[PDB]
Amino acid sequence: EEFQQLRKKYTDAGQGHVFAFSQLFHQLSSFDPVRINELADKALNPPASLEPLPDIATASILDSDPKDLEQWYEEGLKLVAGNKVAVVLMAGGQGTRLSAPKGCFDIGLPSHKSLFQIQAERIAKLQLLAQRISGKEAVIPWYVMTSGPTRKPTEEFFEQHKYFGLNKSDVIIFEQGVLPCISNEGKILMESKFKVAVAPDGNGGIYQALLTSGVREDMRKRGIEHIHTYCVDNCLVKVADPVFIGFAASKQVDIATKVVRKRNATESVGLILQKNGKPDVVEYSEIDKETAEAKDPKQPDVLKFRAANIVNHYYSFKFFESIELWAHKLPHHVARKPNGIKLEQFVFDVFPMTPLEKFACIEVRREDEFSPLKNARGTGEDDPDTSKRDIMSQGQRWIEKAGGIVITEGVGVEVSPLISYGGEGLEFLKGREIKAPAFIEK
């Protein structure tokens, strides 16, 4: 009846094969088969000039003036105190490459805290450091962007931990768009017959997702003016980092990015770059050996092209307000996964559309800021062990810097975010001994 109305519209569009054979009816009613055809069509039928970003657009935790760094931290913490700052978490992944949602993974710290909890606590701590200047509660909304599979386990998990101390009203879980799977000839793939194989539409899907879910409208009501985005797998992420916030808003950019230093020319890292006079992210493959090896004229101890992308972004709210102008302009790329294709928009494809003066980039310290969880244990790289080690190494550093004496007879100290957000506030440990492995907690 109504069912056959659907089977007609899909068959007319060359996708009647998915009705070949009751939940299907509903899954398929959420898809425009024609729009699938459009994206499959444009995606299946589509010597660049590379230069570093302008020095006017770049800063460095390592190299910039301690005077500017301190001031940016202060201004960024001002913005947090005025409830102007928001975080959008990219939390789509599952832990299958390592089960549960990725943010639930326990990399094996002494506390056994998940990634979600570690991040929540950095938010809690940061609002508390902001309160010391505002005099009142500070609120950083945490918009958690999940995939379809992860939405309910994420909700139940945050519910089971009582939202890690934050107000339920300040943790907003929501969903990014999805697309069916499609074969090599653009025909929708069938996971089983009772359900379409689907997938999330790339980290570029965030922009449209901010509208559909009502997240942008919620930010508007709150007076949000600055937004930090990152991926849940960065176990060291400085959530809502004031130095980043302060930097970007002092230059009043639409978009800013965080990088770490590429130190050896052969590292396979994406680079934030001027590609054809536009800001862009360039894969390592499109980088020539000469340009990869090029040393900086004004600094031969470092490489010319050294801004290694870590998917860690800043946006103005004004920029979000403009999404309706260009959101359609964003191509759905092809992700081959030898049977099929995944149409994925790319978060950075909007970069070249940004005027150069509206774009900025800050290099940060790897060991304090980027330890990605990507691989199973024993891999030796981007795994729970390197993640564990980076956090416990940072913890020992912070302590030792404030005068603590850490003793290792077998390494590192887990410092809870609630005690210290970024190494501050540890003078109480001056003089005392600590037997590593150890765990410092509120």
Numbering used by the authors: 30 to 50, 60 to 84, 91 to 142, 145 to 383, 401 to 473, 476 to 507
What does the paper behind this entry write?
UDP-GlcNAc pyrophosphorylase (E.C.2.7.7.23) is a member of the large family of nucleotide diphosphate sugar pyrophosphorylases. Eukaryotic UDP-GlcNAc pyrophosphorylase catalyzes the synthesis of UDP-GlcNAc from UTP and GlcNAc-1P and also the reverse pyrophosphorolysis of UDP-GlcNAc (UTP + GlcNAc-1P ⇔ UDP-GlcNAc + PPi). AfUAP1 possesses a three-domain fold with the central catalytic domain flanked by two domains of unknown function. AfUAP1 has a large active site cleft, with its wall being formed by the central domain and the C-terminal domains.
To understand the catalytic mechanism, two further complexes were also determined – a substrate complex with GlcNAc-1P and a substrate complex with UTP. Ligand binding at the bottom of the active site induces a number of significant conformational changes compared to the “apo-like” structure. The binding of GlcNAc-1P to AfUAP1 is stabilized by hydrogen bonds with Asn249, Gly316, Tyr330, Glu329, Asn355 and Lys437. Interestingly, a PO43− molecule which occupies the same position as the UTP γ-phosphate interacts with R141 and T140 and induce a shift of loops A, B, C, D and α* on the central domain, closing the active site (RMSD vs. “apo-like” structure = 2.1 Å on all Cα atoms). Similar interactions were seen in the CaUAP1–GlcNAc-1P complex with equivalent residues (Tyr310, Asn227, Glu309, Gly294, Asn335, and Lys421) except for the absence of the PO43− molecule, which prevents the ordering of R116 (R141 in AfUAP1). We hypothesise that in the absence of this PO43− molecule, the binding of GlcNAc-1P alone would only cause partial closure of the active site. Lys437 makes direct contacts with the phosphate group of GlcNAc-1P and with the α and β-phosphate of UDP-GlcNAc. Tyr330 establishes a hydrogen bond with the phosphate group of GlcNAc-1P, and Lys148 is involved in UTP binding, contacting the phosphate groups of UTP and pyrophosphate through direct and indirect hydrogen bonds. In agreement with the structural data, the K148M and Y330F mutants affect the Km values of UTP (10-fold increase) and GlcNAc-1P (6-fold increase), respectively. The K437A mutant shows an increase in the Km values of both substrates (32 and 10-fold increase in the Kms of GlcNAc-1P and UTP respectively), which may be the result of disrupting the interaction of Lys437 with the phosphate groups of GlcNAc-1P and UDP-GlcNAc.
